């Protein structure tokens, strides 16, 4: 395990490590690419050569409200090399850019995508889809209520293409809170949590859905399509998970090469005060839940002293990436040889504490030569100088 310094970050809100960046860290071919922002708040631009420790470093033109820890940078490269860069929203006007030429850094003018409800965006994220397209999620808040929208980029048009403006639906009554991931054959994954008031508490269950025709169809884990857009009353439910759980919004999800989805959170159980995390998984069959931590310390979400977890599997192996206060604030694993039956081996990857930290990963590294990379910089959520990001290769 080895930790591979970047350069220096902004270090006095959690803006550049936190769960929903998607991606912070970015493999193509033999190349690994990085965003963050800098200790003056500009987003800067890393690659290396995935041998090397060597990075190359540019600052870009961008500042954003690092501040405000939603303000967050995504990043992906298309299938032709060129880095789609969408960063520093709060319910904001989309930023995005794309570079000048594939696998430079060096970033063009902000422009939109389609022009349409793109005046209110929270936690922009990109996915890569089949044949070196792209996929863009982001919260819309135009209308009052987050709203997921989906578009299509077509690598060989150069152009992005609304695939869902509703496909998630709250029927004017709840929130949702959504997380994605694309797997090994291109298909989409979703999950998600409601919300029915606008209290944190009143978070409820795990829903899922997937598509494997870049987002125009969607299906159960069982097999069968959606009617949209996707309510309450027909959603599938991985997991029920009342309110008042504890229930966190916005954590991560993966995918094995079966195409079987896994979705990592945390709540608490009805006789005990203690939140757990969790993993609720679909291997084909039937969904699953398991209590991944062994944790004694209570908190409530009514800085959270547990981060949202990141997951990697390989053929029900799990890496279950996480941070807790009972582990002195470091980067944790746990890692299970069989998700459901094997015993969880709970080990830290830092000596040192990263406070605010939450994880995120090369989720193209991993698919695509089963090395897992996270995105490490010690951060707080607060008078704190920047802090050296890392690499830190498990």
Not at 12 to 36: A, C, H, K, M, P
Not at 60 to 78: E, F, R
Not at 322 to 344: I, N, P
């Amino acid at each position: 395990s080895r930790l591979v310094e970047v350069g220096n970050g902004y270090s006095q809100t959690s803006v550049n490590t936190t769960v929903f960046r998607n991606n912070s860290l970015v493999t193509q071919g033999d190349e690994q690419y990085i965003s963050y922002y800098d200790g003056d708040g500009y987003l800067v631009l890393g690659k290396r050569k995935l041998n090397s420790d060597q990075w190359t470093l540019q600052r870009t033109q961008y500042k954003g409200n690092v501040k405000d820890a939603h303000n967050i940078i995504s990043m992906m490269l298309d299938g032709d090399g060129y880095l789609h860069l969408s960063f520093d929203h709060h319910g904001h006007k989309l930023n995005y850019c794309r570079s000048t030429a594939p696998y430079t850094l060096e970033l063009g003018d902000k422009e939109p995508m389609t022009g349409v409800d793109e005046g209110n965006v929270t936690y922009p994220e990109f996915y890569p889809l089949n044949g070196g397209d792209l996929l863009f999620v982001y919260r819309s808040g135009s209308s009052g209520r987050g709203n997921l929208v989906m578009n299509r980029y077509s690598v060989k048009e150069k152009k992005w293409y609304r695939v869902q403006d509703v496909l998630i639906d709250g029927e004017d009554q709840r929130n949702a809170y959504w997380q994605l991931y694309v797997d090994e054959q291109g298909t989409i994954h979703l999950s998600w949590v409601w919300r029915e008031t606008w209290h944190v508490e009143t978070n409820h269950d795990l829903c899922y859905a997937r598509s494997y025709d870049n987002g125009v169809t969607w299906y159960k884990a069982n097999g069968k399509k959606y009617d949209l857009p996707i309510r309450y009353n027909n959603a599938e439910y991985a997991c029920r998970i009342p309110q008042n759980s504890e229930l966190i919004n916005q954590t991560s999800m993966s995918a094995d090469a079966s195409g079987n989805p896994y979705i990592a959170t945390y709540w608490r159980d009805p006789d005990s005060d203690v939140p757990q995390y969790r993993i609720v998984w679909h291997d084909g069959q039937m969904w699953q839940n398991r209590q991944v931590s062994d944790r004694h310390t209570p908190f409530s979400l009514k800085m959270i002293p547990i981060a949202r977890p990141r997951i990697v599997v390989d053929g029900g192996e799990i890496f279950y990436i996480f941070r807790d206060e009972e582990r002195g604030s470091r980067v944790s694993m746990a890692h299970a040889q069989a998700v459901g039956t094997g015993k969880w081996t709970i080990t830290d990857l830092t000596d040192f504490a990263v406070d605010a930290w939450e994880p995120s990963h090369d989720t193209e590294l991993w698919k695509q030569k089963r090395r897992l990379h996270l995105f490490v910089q010690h951060t707080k959520q607060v008078e704190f100088a920047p802090q050296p990001v890392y690499v830190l290769e498990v």
